[PDB]
Design an enzyme around this catalytic site. Sequence first.
Site, PDB file in Angstrom:
ATOM      1  CB  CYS A 105      -1.022  -0.094   1.138  1.00  0.00           C
ATOM      2  SG  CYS A 105      -2.264   1.212   1.000  1.00  0.00           S
ATOM      3  CG  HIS A 125      -3.420   2.923  -2.456  1.00  0.00           C
ATOM      4  ND1 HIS A 125      -3.972   4.036  -3.021  1.00  0.00           N
ATOM      5  CD2 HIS A 125      -4.449   2.152  -2.064  1.00  0.00           C
ATOM      6  CE1 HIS A 125      -5.282   3.950  -2.974  1.00  0.00           C
ATOM      7  NE2 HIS A 125      -5.586   2.802  -2.414  1.00  0.00           N
TER       8      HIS A 125
HETATM    9 ZN   LIG Z   1      -3.509   1.147   2.655  1.00  0.00          ZN
END
Ligand SMILES: [Zn+2]
EC number: 3.1.2.-
Lengths: 187, 187
Positions: A105, A125
């Site tokens: 992420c 991400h």
């Molecule tokens: Zn995240």
Amino acid sequence: ASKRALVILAKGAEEMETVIPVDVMRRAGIKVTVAGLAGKDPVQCSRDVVICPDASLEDAKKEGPYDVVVLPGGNLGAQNLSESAAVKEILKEQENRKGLIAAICAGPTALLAHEIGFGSKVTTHPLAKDKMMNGGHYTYSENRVEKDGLILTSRGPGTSFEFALAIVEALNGKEVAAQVKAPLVLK
Amino acid sequence: ASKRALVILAKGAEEMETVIPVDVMRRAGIKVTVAGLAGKDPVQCSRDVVICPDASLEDAKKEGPYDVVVLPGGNLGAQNLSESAAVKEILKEQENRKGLIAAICAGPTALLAHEIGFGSKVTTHPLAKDKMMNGGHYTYSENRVEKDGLILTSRGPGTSFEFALAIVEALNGKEVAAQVKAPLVLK
Ligand SMILES: [Zn+2]
Ligand SMILES: [Cl-]
Ligand SMILES: [Cl-]
Ligand SMILES: [Zn+2]
């Protein structure tokens, strides 16, 4: 002998991206240490879930080496990881010894901060792409999980299971990953 | 006005099935109370993740009613929920007032224990089917998420996001569920 994982848990970590890999790795018979960046005390995650780490990072780093170092995401968790001299040293050692580093992420942006794995193909991400790509030190991928040798990255909460199972496969093999996967009821 | 969710957290709960719904509901602007079955102290989950609840159940149940009562799974967590007189009373009240009850994995077996929602179509983890179906009081489904009016059930760790988003859609609508879903990077 069982493989060992160090999961570094900072204030503002994404709790899903922390818990899913911890749980799935423990299902795979990996000895997981959830280590608190700031010390031994409970950690307030991004969505206010409070997790009690197994040990401070200060203590856990004395019980290495680990077969994987795992960096959860969460914008503010990743920033805390990025600012940590302790994390820098842990990741440099892990890279130097050819051990796996796994980040999800916003987590991979800590790799940039600590100059780890330059030249790797990586994902993040979508909202963390520009940060990760500042300077062009990595090549960007939109794969849900990206493994370039010993640098394993993934994109978000919704890729956490695939990320975790990729870590399991890298440590314990495809058969164990498949065995762990089947009871989870993944699509 | 913001909707409110009570998430009942027992020893041996599946931590993924606890954290994913908490986090996703908080993303949806729901006020989530993570309530410890046993009291205010941290809870050791099924894979040894230790979560600090927001309140004891004893206290949180005084601040109702809630728009949803959420029962995580985990075999031993669900058994603890099934044995709890406090849970029985909370679920009976919730059913009586036509409020949503959401349960995942082994969690729906607490519905059987407390005689909640008989006649509903339900799902569970595959390994919890026979327990849930003892007596034929429900009709079984293999859908990943099953919503039969005010009884919402789901199957396992890997259906937790779909379960959570279903709770969000039921409380806050399809548009908010879609908005919350997009940043998660679900497949
Ligand atoms: Zn995240
Ligand atoms: Cl975040
Ligand atoms: Cl379980
Ligand atoms: Zn479960």
